[PDB]
Design a protein around this ligand. Structure first.
Ligand SMILES: [Mg+2]
Ligand SMILES: [Mg+2]
Ligand SMILES: [Mg+2]
Ligand SMILES: [Mg+2]
Ligand SMILES: [Mg+2]
Ligand SMILES: [Mg+2]
Ligand SMILES: [Mg+2]
Ligand SMILES: [Mg+2]
Ligand SMILES: [Mg+2]
Ligand SMILES: [Mg+2]
Ligand SMILES: [Mg+2]
Ligand SMILES: [Mg+2]
Ligand SMILES: [Mg+2]
Ligand SMILES: [Mg+2]
Ligand SMILES: [Mg+2]
Ligand SMILES: [Mg+2]
Ligand SMILES: [Mg+2]
Ligand SMILES: [Mg+2]
Ligand SMILES: [Mg+2]
Ligand SMILES: [Mg+2]
Ligand SMILES: [Mg+2]
Ligand SMILES: [Mg+2]
Ligand SMILES: [Mg+2]
Ligand SMILES: [Zn+2]
Lengths: 116, 208, 155, 60, 99, 126
RNA sequence: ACUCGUGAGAGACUGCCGGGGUCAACUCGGAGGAAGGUGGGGAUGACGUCAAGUCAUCAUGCCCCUUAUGUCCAGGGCUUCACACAUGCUACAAUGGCCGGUACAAAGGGCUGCGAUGCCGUGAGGUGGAGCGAAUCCUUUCAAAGCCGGUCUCAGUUCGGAUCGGGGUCUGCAACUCGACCCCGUGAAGUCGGAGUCGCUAGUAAUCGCAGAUCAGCAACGCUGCGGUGAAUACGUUCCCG
């Protein structure tokens, strides 16, 4: 289906369909599903528009999802990297914050491995 | 490393503890006071070789046992050294302490005494050859003891290299846990440095 | 192994049916030693195999064992700086172990979307002659009659 | 174990966070056991000498 | 009916049994009924420290703490019985908990 | 009153035999609900069928120590020895089956320098 | 009347038989017996080698500083990082992840410490604090895999969890470098793997938990031990290493 510009799965459970939205994960999917009262095991084929609309209203009223989240996170990054703190420098030079073993780990932050 | 301490190995069967008491609350202080008083005894008393030190403690009372070849200098005819030892004990505040002095029946059959004698001989002028000849012959003079080994390591004669030499005579079953092994060691002083002396004493076996 | 022939464990018979071949099969299909789940998988696969074939499970298993049990095997040896393959006959116990164990380790590797069904369907394929077990039998025989001429070493 | 370091650790620090063990015989800041207050080397030598009441070889 | 737990709880088998025999004899000529030294789970402490400093840690040794504990459940706590009980002098091996 | 104890790798059990029906009670529940595994069910019904005295002995068992297979083998041995104690004439038959002799294997000593039991860490000569 | 636990004693000594054996050691088979031919595992390292490792556990000859290379805090760094090697953990997905229901362990720590019941928190934890110097009180009735029910139909996935940001707790005088834990979003990489190479022959391999400990927190997937489910094969020394 379609919800908040996101193509809902052809045939998947709503607990995963809602997680496919950027601002919702597994825990909040379960929480919102329990709050609305809809069964978590129902297939996609049986969705109806009114529940989709009311869930959309609920989620937009109580949470921020997708492009707005993009803008808040990126604006925070640009701000606190402009103020020049240690996390700001870590984002500048592309290395993780938590002071983990940058010895050999953090190749996630390093991207692909290039041999010198 | 080559060999573990025979005393530790056979400590569970043939030999007995020198210090016996029970503590769970303040056992760290019990053991630290024990080691402190043993260090001060070792430092102060060097003229007379302390063969064994034994303590048993209940509640506050503690009774120290000192085994020495001769008690003449360990305790004076008037008690000057005993008074000094009691003064040291009360300075470390060992509360009420009672001391016992026991003289060994055969000074040449105990590991610590012969080790100290050989260490003194090596320290002053005596060569290791004659020193060990005298020690071994005095050892085998006693009928009860059977097997003897003595070992020394370090700079012998002032040479710029390390000699590890030992003499064996008799039967000393290290591997036999039944064997009655008496272990002793001491660090002798010398102008060129320090040399270690290691001795094992076999005296019969026990059945049961 | 140098000192002599080691004693063999007295493996217990399967009490559900009466064939210890099932016991050896579950022992082979053991994954990190979880026998309860392993044997329930084995029994479910055998039940669905019964439903698919409409015949006796023990008869089908015996037929598959007969079809994919070997008689000759190939061993490697290096002589004079060169390695060669020599064939030697195998005992029937060894043969049964190899047959069932190749059956299971090939059932591990299909794409039938679920291996509990893969087990039964490889059993069926070994029974009817279309399985990975029988194609390995063809390959191993091809290698055997390809190198029968090295039997003069007799090692 | 520098004796000045040992004595400085011995005095009561300005904060309770500055206290460690520093084995009494040798002042070893690492490899310590609390119930005895001794480090590995001191514990081993005392156990082998038989001066600590109880520690002995175990096998089972 | 009053029960007082006499605990003979220490390390060593020989001395703890000496103390148990002495307590049993005291009860015997004192005139009290006692079950005796019932078996109890002995505490077994294992500590592992490395036998050599500066690496070489593949070879080690273990140490053991056998904490031997005995229970002496006395019945009919006669005042003369308890008086003799705390007037007995015991070796340093065994510790008594009069509870 | 006849008593028995099973000894399989630090697992201890105590079962009491009754000459009544063949009903099994494991800590207040039958074998069909307690530990629902057919291998266990069959290894527990095995001694009575092999002695051919089926459905003649009630058992009341207590379980302690070890884990699932340990307890199963422990009660296994428990009834194995109880049947001989109440009827020694089948002792040759059971020992020929290999069934009166207990299997005394357990978790072995965990060795210093080893990850667990007897396994050694990864080894490289480079 | 049994385990439960811990004392004493008994029980494996080729004890007995047949055959080979120099009538000698010894071996195979056989009965009894729990074990059969050192029943299983540990502690237990002969003379010596590598001038092997340790003057930063300790002790020490020589040389060197002594107004400094000594002491104390005017904070910081031991954890920095374009890259490699070594040993682990978690996986790469269905013998699975997740959700609900559900049964079995051993041993061990606790004084300026363990910490119940109760209330508030998603949860770190906060208030309060019984019982304990300890078979008793706390470490939950010590469980996890184990059994039943439901989903996923094989996707870079309901696998997989890092990275970064937003919000708190805990130790502490004070968490930026440079802690841990709790909550959210974050969704990159990778589909059993190159020659070569490791460990394992019975509770073993393989897999799933707990605990000693240093400590005030904590890089705790570690060392050590305590457990749980539990295999396969050995045709024999021709080849490789000792
Ligand atoms: Mg501290
Ligand atoms: Mg230390
Ligand atoms: Mg055990
Ligand atoms: Mg284990
Ligand atoms: Mg290691
Ligand atoms: Mg040697
Ligand atoms: Mg050297
Ligand atoms: Mg230096
Ligand atoms: Mg020195
Ligand atoms: Mg110096
Ligand atoms: Mg630093
Ligand atoms: Mg540092
Ligand atoms: Mg290496
Ligand atoms: Mg996972
Ligand atoms: Mg559950
Ligand atoms: Mg439960
Ligand atoms: Mg709550
Ligand atoms: Mg994930
Ligand atoms: Mg991949
Ligand atoms: Mg795939
Ligand atoms: Mg290869
Ligand atoms: Mg794991
Ligand atoms: Mg700690
Ligand atoms: Zn120390």
């Amino acid at each position: 289906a379609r919800l908040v510009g996101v193509d809902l799965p052809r045939d998947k459970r709503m607990e995963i369909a809602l997680t496919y939205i950027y601002g919702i994960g597994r825990t909040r999917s379960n929480e919102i599903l329990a709050a609305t009262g809809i069964d978590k095991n129902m297939r996609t084929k049986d969705l109806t528009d009114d529940q989709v609309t009311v869930l959309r209203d609920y989620i937009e009223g109580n949470l921020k999802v997708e492009g707005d989240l993009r803008r808040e996170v990126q604006a925070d990054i640009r701000r606190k990297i402009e103020i020049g703190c240690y996390q700001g420098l870590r984002h500048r030079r592309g290395l993780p914050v938590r002071g983990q073993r940058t010895k050999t780990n953090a190749r996630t932050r390093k991207g692909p491995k290039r041999t010198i | 490393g080559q060999k573990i301490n025979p005393h530790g190995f056979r400590l569970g069967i043939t030999t007995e503890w020198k210090s016996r008491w029970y503590a769970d609350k303040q056992y760290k202080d019990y053991v630290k006071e024990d080691v402190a008083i043993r260090k001060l005894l070792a430092t102060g008393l060097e003229r007379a070789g302390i063969a064994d030190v034994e303590i048993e403690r209940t509640r506050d009372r503690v009774r120290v046992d000192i085994h020495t070849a001769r008690p003449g200098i360990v305790i004076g005819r008037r008690g000057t050294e005993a008074d000094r030892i009691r003064a040291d004990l009360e300075k470390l505040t060992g509360k009420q302490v009672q001391l016992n002095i026991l003289e060994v029946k055969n000074p040449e059959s105990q590991a610590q005494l012969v080790a100290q004698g050989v260490a003194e001989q090596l320290s002053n002028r005596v060569a290791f050859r004659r020193a060990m000849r005298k020690a071994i012959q005095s050892a085998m003079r006693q009928p009860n003891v059977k097997g003897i080994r003595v070992q020394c390591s370090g700079r012998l004669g002032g040479a710029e290299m390390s000699r590890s030499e030992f003499y064996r005579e008799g039967r000393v079953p290290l591997h036999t846990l039944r064997a009655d092994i008496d272990y002793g060691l001491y660090e002798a002083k010398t102008t060129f440095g320090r040399i270690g002396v290691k001795v094992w004493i076999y005296k019969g076996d026990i059945v049961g | 192994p140098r000192k002599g022939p080691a004693p063999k464990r007295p493996l217990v018979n399967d009490p559900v049916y009466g064939s210890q071949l099932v016991t050896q099969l579950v022992n082979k299909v053991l994954l990190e030693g979880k026998k309860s789940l392993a044997e329930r998988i084995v029994y479910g696969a055998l039940e669905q195999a019964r439903e698919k074939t409409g015949t006796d499970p023990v008869v089908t298993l015996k037929r598959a064992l007969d079809n994919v049990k070997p008689a000759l095997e190939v061993r490697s040896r290096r002589v004079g700086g060169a390695t060669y393959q020599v064939p030697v006959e195998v005992r029937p116990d060894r043969s049964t172990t190899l047959a069932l164990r190749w059956l299971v380790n090939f059932s591990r590797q299909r794409r039938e979307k679920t291996m509990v069904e893969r087990l039964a369907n490889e059993i069926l394929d070994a029974s009817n002659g279309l399985g990975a077990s029988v194609k390995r039998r063809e390959d191993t025989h091809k290698m055997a009659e390809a190198n029968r001429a090295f039997a003069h070493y007799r090692w | 174990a520098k004796k000045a370091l040992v004595h400085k650790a011995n005095k009561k620090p300005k904060f309770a966070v500055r206290a460690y063990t520093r084995c009494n015989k040798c002042g070893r800041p690492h490899s310590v056991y609390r119930k005895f207050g001794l480090c590995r080397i001191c514990l081993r030598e005392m156990a082998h000498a038989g001066e600590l009441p109880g520690v002995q070889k175990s096998s089972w | 009916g009053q029960k007082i737990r006499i605990r003979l709880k220490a390390y060593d088998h020989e001395a703890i049994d000496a103390s148990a025999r002495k307590i049993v004899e005291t009860v015997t000529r004192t005139g009290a009924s006692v079950v005796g030294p019932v078996p109890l789970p002995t505490e077994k402490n294992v500590y592992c420290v490395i036998r050599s400093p500066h690496k070489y840690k593949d070879s080690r040794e273990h140490f053991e703490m056998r904490t031997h504990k005995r229970l002496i459940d006395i019945l009919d706590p006669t005042p003369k019985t308890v008086d003799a009980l705390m007037r007995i002098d015991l070796p340093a091996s065994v510790d008594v908990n009069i509870q | 009153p006849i008593q028995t104890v099973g000894r399989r790798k630090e697992a201890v059990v105590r079962v009491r035999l009754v000459p009544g029906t063949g009903q099994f009670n494991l800590d207040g529940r039958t074998l069909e609900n307690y530990f629902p595994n057919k291998v266990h069910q069959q290894l527990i019904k095995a001694p009575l069928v092999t002695v051919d005295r089926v459905d003649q002995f009630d058992i009341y068992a207590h379980l302690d120590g070890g884990g699932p297979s340990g307890q199963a083998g422990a009660l296994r041995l428990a009834i194995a020895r109880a049947l001989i104690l109440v009827q020694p004439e089948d002792r040759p038959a059971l020992k020929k089956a290999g069934f009166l002799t207990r299997d005394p294997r357990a978790i072995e000593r965990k060795k210093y320098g080893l990850k667990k039991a007897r396994k050694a860490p990864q080894y490289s000569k480079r």
